[PDB]
Design an enzyme around this catalytic site. Structure first.
Site, short mmCIF file in Angstrom:
data_model
loop_
_atom_site.label_atom_id
_atom_site.label_comp_id
_atom_site.label_asym_id
_atom_site.label_seq_id
_atom_site.Cartn_x
_atom_site.Cartn_y
_atom_site.Cartn_z
N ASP A 297 1.00 -1.04 0.01
CA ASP A 297 -0.10 0.00 0.00
C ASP A 297 0.79 1.35 0.02
OD1 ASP A 297 -1.27 2.31 1.55
OD2 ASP A 297 -2.95 0.98 0.95
N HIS A 298 2.02 1.22 0.71
CA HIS A 298 2.89 2.29 0.96
C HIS A 298 3.96 2.43 -0.25
CE1 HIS A 298 2.36 2.36 5.46
NE2 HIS A 298 1.26 2.32 4.94
N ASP A 299 3.87 1.56 -1.33
CA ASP A 299 4.39 1.72 -2.74
C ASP A 299 3.46 2.45 -3.56
OD1 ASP A 299 6.03 1.14 -5.03
OD2 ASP A 299 6.48 -0.99 -4.47
C1 HEC Z 1 -3.26 -4.09 3.05
C2 HEC Z 1 -3.75 -2.93 3.47
C3 HEC Z 1 -3.73 -2.26 4.55
C4 HEC Z 1 -2.72 -2.75 5.83
C5 HEC Z 1 -2.39 -4.27 6.15
C6 HEC Z 1 -2.85 -1.50 6.54
N1 HEC Z 1 -3.23 -0.45 6.00
FE1 HEC Z 1 -3.93 1.33 6.90
N2 HEC Z 1 -4.07 2.01 5.10
C7 HEC Z 1 -4.08 1.42 4.02
C8 HEC Z 1 -4.23 2.36 3.06
C9 HEC Z 1 -4.45 1.77 1.37
C10 HEC Z 1 -4.34 3.73 3.52
C11 HEC Z 1 -4.62 4.92 2.75
C12 HEC Z 1 -3.10 5.39 2.37
C13 HEC Z 1 -3.37 6.72 1.59
O1 HEC Z 1 -3.40 6.97 0.61
O2 HEC Z 1 -3.11 8.06 2.53
C14 HEC Z 1 -4.17 3.50 4.89
C15 HEC Z 1 -4.47 4.39 5.86
C16 HEC Z 1 -4.12 4.48 6.99
C17 HEC Z 1 -4.09 5.49 8.23
C18 HEC Z 1 -4.63 6.66 7.62
C19 HEC Z 1 -6.09 6.97 8.11
C20 HEC Z 1 -7.02 8.15 7.89
O3 HEC Z 1 -7.26 9.29 8.65
O4 HEC Z 1 -7.58 8.16 6.59
C21 HEC Z 1 -3.85 4.76 9.30
C22 HEC Z 1 -4.04 5.62 10.49
C23 HEC Z 1 -3.52 3.77 8.84
N3 HEC Z 1 -3.76 3.25 7.63
C24 HEC Z 1 -2.97 2.83 9.87
C25 HEC Z 1 -2.60 1.34 9.79
C26 HEC Z 1 -2.15 0.69 10.69
C27 HEC Z 1 -1.69 0.94 12.21
C28 HEC Z 1 -1.43 -0.55 10.21
C29 HEC Z 1 -1.00 -1.77 10.71
C30 HEC Z 1 0.33 -1.70 11.44
C31 HEC Z 1 -2.27 -0.43 8.58
N4 HEC Z 1 -2.83 0.70 8.51
C32 HEC Z 1 -2.23 -1.53 7.98
C33 HEC Z 1 -3.89 0.06 4.03
C34 HEC Z 1 -3.53 -0.76 4.70
N1 LIG Z 2 -2.25 8.25 5.08
C1 LIG Z 2 -1.64 7.56 6.20
C2 LIG Z 2 -1.08 8.35 7.22
C3 LIG Z 2 -0.56 7.92 8.35
C4 LIG Z 2 0.22 8.55 9.57
C5 LIG Z 2 -0.81 10.06 9.79
C6 LIG Z 2 -1.98 9.96 10.34
C7 LIG Z 2 -3.05 9.82 9.75
C8 LIG Z 2 -4.43 9.85 10.37
C9 LIG Z 2 -4.43 9.89 11.82
C10 LIG Z 2 -3.38 10.11 12.62
C11 LIG Z 2 -2.09 10.12 11.92
C12 LIG Z 2 1.69 8.95 9.44
C13 LIG Z 2 2.57 8.09 9.92
C14 LIG Z 2 4.00 8.33 10.22
C15 LIG Z 2 4.24 9.23 9.06
C16 LIG Z 2 3.23 9.91 8.07
C17 LIG Z 2 2.04 9.75 8.52
C18 LIG Z 2 -0.55 6.41 8.35
N2 LIG Z 2 -0.16 5.58 9.32
N3 LIG Z 2 -0.24 4.19 8.81
N4 LIG Z 2 -0.92 4.33 7.62
C19 LIG Z 2 -0.84 5.62 7.26
N5 LIG Z 2 -1.54 6.30 6.28
CA LIG Z 3 5.72 3.33 -6.30
#
Ligand code: HEC
Ligand SMILES: Nc1cc([C@H](Cc2ccccc2)c2ccccc2)c2nn[nH]c2n1
Ligand SMILES: [Ca+2]
Ligand SMILES: *[C@@H]1O[C@H](CO[C@@H]2O[C@@H](C)[C@@H](O)[C@@H](O)[C@@H]2O)[C@@H](O)[C@H](O)[C@H]1NC(C)=O
Ligand SMILES: CC(=O)N[C@@H]1[C@@H](O)[C@H](O)[C@@H](CO)O[C@H]1O
Ligand SMILES: CC(=O)N[C@@H]1[C@@H](O)[C@H](O)[C@@H](CO)O[C@H]1O
Ligand SMILES: *[C@@H]1O[C@H](CO)[C@@H](O)[C@H](O)[C@H]1NC(C)=O
Ligand SMILES: *[C@@H]1O[C@H](CO)[C@@H](O)[C@H](O)[C@H]1NC(C)=O
Ligand SMILES: OC[C@H]1O[C@H](O)[C@@H](O)[C@@H](O)[C@@H]1O
Ligand SMILES: [Cl-]
Ligand SMILES: [Cl-]
EC number: 1.11.2.2
Lengths: 464, 103
Positions: free
Chosen positions: B94-96
């Site tokens: 997702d982070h890629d």
């Molecule tokens: C396989 C999918 C998947 C996994 C596993 C996952 N996430 Fe998510 N997460 C996402 C995606 C997609 C987003 C949106 C990223 C973006 O575009 O900013 C996201 C967004 C977030 C956000 C931003 C929330 C907001 O305000 O909208 C947080 C916090 C977050 N994830 C925390 C976690 C944490 C904690 C973990 C585990 C250690 C995690 N995620 C594992 C896919 C995942």
């Molecule tokens: N789009 C995001 C954002 C973050 C946080 C920021 C955040 C968002 C919502 C509420 C609270 C804090 C972040 C952590 C570390 C560095 C930058 C950003 C995520 N952490 N995991 N997945 C994520 N996806």
């Molecule tokens: Ca990429």
């Protein structure tokens, strides 16, 4: 000031508190929320849209960076070895750790006040979000340096730029191979894999490779797989005493655990030999993310599932039935019809009680409520959104590892033998790893084999 | 775009020669459906008290989470056919792909 205010004024969109909430008894409080940056700020002509700060391609941008200044700062430029910079203060049993970042307000320092271990610096800013994620980033950093070192001995005239680019190209292809051959089939199941990802033919420059707005919310299905603890295992895959099951609300931003509590090996062992949480219609997401998300580094614990719903509204995403219609799936209007689509009248009754109409169900909520497709971990709607996205990333990528010209036939055949268990063998002290498929294998010793049985990537075809 | 290239750019620029920002970083997401906002162009559903979405009141995201997502932690069902690495690769992947910045 979103972090502390409850007033609804741009750019804040705080989540209000319902009566009789199980945790937040103060209804004048709220869950903080910042609206995503608009692509065209202040406009009264364009329909509001959001930004992707990353490259959409599966190019290991979470390792290499998506902006040139950061990508330069990530490399070791004191020599011509094409290496990625490593931590100069600490090592993991002689092995490299990610460099430390220089953040003004560092959240990793808040998790252990006396340890004084800051956040790590990687291609993506979220690398220290959980030590399990940090472990994966650290493993890929070591793999790049291992590749650039083998390539230097094989081709001594190659300079630092050539070595960096050639190792980068391999790591990117490795991320594409693990993702499409091993990961996605286990997400979609066989029939949706055949439907949305038929056999690759060649690059198509008319395929738009951008991430769709809805995918940023639909791919949050992964939240339903999160276990409430970080599991660490010793050399013999037994609990690493006396902290083998640390709750997730004590590992968020806890970079000090990687540095001071045994490195990445106990963590990588725990990811391999511990089952994932299963998504059930009455067991959707755990309270470590639903109640205590970022508790140590924030004024209040967040609700990740509720943030996902608020984020879809912030992003102006249409409801459940519009996405079902987009996907060519039936659109239920009454509780009975929704009961048939979900094979669960009870869940449909509760969804109707909240939303009134299946037209208003938020995309993440509706998506994760669907019954799982056979041998997959998503239902019909999410399989469509996810499959459509991943097909566009493969078919619309000029540097896709199987595209004619990218690698030689000999290089493609050598890359076909890669696997995540082998990358763990090469870059860690772990000698016993999961059998392929790593994403399925989860029980020690039944699903495990020795390093010596898995052959390594043969770089012979990379010799000039 | 240079007529001949061996490697990807860091930003993803020049991957698609006809539309060179496609897939590149710091660009607006593509939309598969038109957006649905309270005022048609900017305000999210839930912003203004009393404004219904398609005939019905907007539900508080926290209330949806409490009534549907919430479950007792001890009743967790382990996946017999998936490792925790399946979850972790998903987040790393997702982070890629995407990061949506906020102010
Ligand atoms: C396989 C999918 C998947 C996994 C596993 C996952 N996430 Fe998510 N997460 C996402 C995606 C997609 C987003 C949106 C990223 C973006 O575009 O900013 C996201 C967004 C977030 C956000 C931003 C929330 C907001 O305000 O909208 C947080 C916090 C977050 N994830 C925390 C976690 C944490 C904690 C973990 C585990 C250690 C995690 N995620 C594992 C896919 C995942
Ligand atoms: N789009 C995001 C954002 C973050 C946080 C920021 C955040 C968002 C919502 C509420 C609270 C804090 C972040 C952590 C570390 C560095 C930058 C950003 C995520 N952490 N995991 N997945 C994520 N996806
Ligand atoms: Ca990429
Ligand atoms: C190249 O792709 C173009 C776009 O097609 C659409 O997107 C891909 C990812 C598939 O989902 C496809 O079903 C969609 O229609 C097509 O216009 C074009 O015809 C394709 N050309 C070839 C030769 O495949
Ligand atoms: C420098 C320092 O405080 N090290 C501590 C150690 O003394 C303690 O036994 C252990 C458990 O709390 O955590 C670590
Ligand atoms: C805007 C919209 O919903 N378009 C859908 C389309 O995506 C779908 O492929 C087709 C067949 O169901 O019906 C129409
Ligand atoms: C760069 O590489 C050299 C040689 O391995 C090493 O000694 C040095 O510490 C590295 N520097 C960084 C910042 O990683
Ligand atoms: C923080 O880390 C130190 C190790 O330097 C440890 O002694 C201490 O107990 C930890 N504190 C907490 C609250 O976990
Ligand atoms: O039946 C599913 C329906 O949606 C999908 C497409 O592959 C269509 O060709 C098909 O008709
Ligand atoms: Cl340093
Ligand atoms: Cl969209």
């Amino acid at each position: 000031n979103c972090e502390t205010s409850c007033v609804q004024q741009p750019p804040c969109f705080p989540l209000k508190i319902p009566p009789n909430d199980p945790r937040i008894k103060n209804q004048a409080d709220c869950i903080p929320f910042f609206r995503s940056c608009p692509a065209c700020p202040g406009s009264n002509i364009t329909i509001r849209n959001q930004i992707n700060a990353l490259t959409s391609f599966v190019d290991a941008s979470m390792v290499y960076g998506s902006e040139e200044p950061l990508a330069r700062n990530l490399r070791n430029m004191s020599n011509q070895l094409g290496l990625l910079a490593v931590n100069q203060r600490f090592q993991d049993n002689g092995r490299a750790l990610l460099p430390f970042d220089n953040l003004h307000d560092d959240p990793c320092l808040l998790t252990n006040r006396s340890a004084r271990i800051p956040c790590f610096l990687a291609g993506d800013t979220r690398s220290s979000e959980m030590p399990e994620l940090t472990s994966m980033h650290t493993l890929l950093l070591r793999e790049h340096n291992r590749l650039a070192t083998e390539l230097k001995s094989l081709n001594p005239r190659w300079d630092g730029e050539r070595l960096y680019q050639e190792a980068r190209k391999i790591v990117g292809a490795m991320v594409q191979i693990i993702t499409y051959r091993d990961y996605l089939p286990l997400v979609l199941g066989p029939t949706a894999m055949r439907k949305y990802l038929p056999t690759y033919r060649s690059y198509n420059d008319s395929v738009d490779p951008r991430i769709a707005n809805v995918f940023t919310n639909a791919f949050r299905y992964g939240h339903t797989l999160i276990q409430p603890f970080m599991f660490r295992l010793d050399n013999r895959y037994q609990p690493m005493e006396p902290n083998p099951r640390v709750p997730l609300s004590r590992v968020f931003f806890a970079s000090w655990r990687v540095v001071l509590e045994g490195g990445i090996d106990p963590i990588l062992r725990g990811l391999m030999a511990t089952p994932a949480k299963l998504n059930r219609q009455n067991q959707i997401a755990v309270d470590e993310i639903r109640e205590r998300l970022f508790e140590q580094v924030m004024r209040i614990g967040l609700d990740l599932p509720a943030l996902n719903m608020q984020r879809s509204r912030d992003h102006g995403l249409p409801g459940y039935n519009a996405w079902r219609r987009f996907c060519g799936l039936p659109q239920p209007e009454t509780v009975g019809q929704l009961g048939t689509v979900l094979r669960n009248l009870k869940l449909a009754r509760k969804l109707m009680e909240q939303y009134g109409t299946p037209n208003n169900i938020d995309i993440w909520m509706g998506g994760v409520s669907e019954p799982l497709k056979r041998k997959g971990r998503v239902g019909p709607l999410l399989a469509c959104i996810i499959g459509t996205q991943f097909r566009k990333l493969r078919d619309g990528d000029r540097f896709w590892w199987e595209n004619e010209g990218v690698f030689s036939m000999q290089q493609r055949q050598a890359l076909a033998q890669i696997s995540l268990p082998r990358i763990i063998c090469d870059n860690t002290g772990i000698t016993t790893v999961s059998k392929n498929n790593i994403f399925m294998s989860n029980s020690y010793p039944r699903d495990f084999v020795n390093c010596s049985t898995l052959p390594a990537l043969n770089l012979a075809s990379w010799r000039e | 775009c240079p007529e001949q290239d061996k490697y990807r750019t860091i930003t993803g620029m020049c991957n698609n020669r006809r539309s060179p920002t496609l897939g590149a970083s710091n660009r607006a997401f593509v939309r598969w459906l038109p957006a649905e906002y309270e005022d048609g162009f900017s305000l999210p559903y839930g912003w203004t008290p009393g404004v219904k979405r398609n005939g019905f009141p907007v539900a508080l995201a926290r209330a949806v989470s409490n009534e549907i997502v919430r479950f007792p932690t001890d009743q967790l069902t382990p996946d017999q056919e998936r490792s925790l690495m399946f979850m972790q690769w998903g987040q790393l992947l997702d982070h890629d792909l995407d990061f949506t910045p906020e102010p």
